[PDB]
Every structure is written in structure tokens, then in C-alpha cells.
Amino acid sequence: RKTLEQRRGEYAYYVIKEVADLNDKQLEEKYASLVKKAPVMILSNGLLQTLAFLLAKAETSPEKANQILSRVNEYPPRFIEKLGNDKDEHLLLYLHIVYWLRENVDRNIDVKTLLSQDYSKVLWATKEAIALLNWMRRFAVAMLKE
Numbered sequence: 001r002k003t004l005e006q007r008r009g010e011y012a013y014y015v016i017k018e019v020a021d022l023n024d025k026q027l028e029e030k031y032a033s034l035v036k037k038a039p040v041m042i043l044s045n046g047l048l049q050t051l052a053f054l055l056a057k058a059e060t061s062p063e064k065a066n067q068i069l070s071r072v073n074e075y076p077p078r079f080i081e082k083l084g085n086d087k088d089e090h091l092l093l094y095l096h097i098v099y100w101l102r103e104n105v106d107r108n109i110d111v112k113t114l115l116s117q118d119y120s121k122v123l124w125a126t127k128e129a130i131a132l133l134n135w136m137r138r139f140a141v142a143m144l145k146e
Contacts, residue, residue, distance in 0.1 A: 004104070005131075012135035014076035015096050020143050022080055024087065031089040032144040038093060039133040047126040048114045051094060055111060058091035062111045065091065069099055100132050101125050 001010050019031050041050045055062060068082045079095050101109045105125050
């Protein structure tokens with residue numbers, strides 16, 4: 001696990017395992033369904049709109065999301081425990097995607113920065129997101145249910 005691909009797989013494995021380990025059937029079914037659509041959502045609508053949509057659906061701001069991410073300091077990263085009693089599957093996915101992008105593409109990436117960044121950085125961030133979500137989708141089919 002040293003190449004980008006291997007690290008994408010390992011990370012996808014752990015975030016999906018966390019959902020499985022929560023033992024919350026509702027959060028698991030909704031999340032599994034959403035992550036399976038994510039890659040197609042980005043391909044057809046783009047990254048910015050998909051991430052904006054996740055925050056909109058979660059009634060959350062990129063500021064609040066970054067505050068949560070700032071607390072994710074260990075590996076494997078623990079996201080679910082960072083949320084409140086209400087585990088929003090849209091915010092969760094948002095966190096999964098942005099954390100990975102900030103870690104492997106640009107630490108400043110988020111819905112608002114993506115409005116100004118050059119075309120090459122957006123393309124890059126978009127291709128990474130797709131590669132990430134493909135793995136996450138594969139693992140959800142392998143580990144989650146609906």
C-alpha cells in the first residue's frame with residue numbers, strides 16, 4: 001500500500017468499514033445508495049455541483065464541514081464520531097471526498113475554493129474524486145447492504 005491506487009483502495013476500505021461498524025441500518029442503506037450514485041453524479045454534473053448538492057442536502061456550510069475535518073487527525077480517519085446524534089449520509093460522503101482531496105490534491109479544496117481555482121486543478125480534483133468514489137462504490141457493494 002504505497003502507490004496512489006493502493007492508498008485509494010485502503011482508504012475507501014476504512015471509511016466504508018466505519019459505516020458498517022456503526023451498525024445503523026438506516027444510515028448504512030441511505031449511504032450505500034448515495035455512494036453508488038456519486039461517481040455518476042460527478043461525471044454528468046461535475047465536482048463543484050455534486051459537493052454543493054451534498055452540503056445543501058445536509059443543510060450545512062463548507063465552514064462547518066472544514067471545522068469537522070480539522071478534527072480528523074488520525075489514520076485510519078474517524079468521521080462518523082465527529083458528527084452529531086444525527087448522522088447525515090450526505091455530509092458524511094462530503095467529508096469522505098473532501099478529506100481525500102485535501103490530502104492528495106490540495107489542502108484548501110472545498111465548495112467555495114472550487115469556484116475560483118484554475119481548470120487544471122478542478123479537472124485533477126474531479127478525476128481524483130471519481131477514482132476515489134469508484135473504490136468506495138466497489139467496497140460498499142462488497143461490505144454494505146440496503
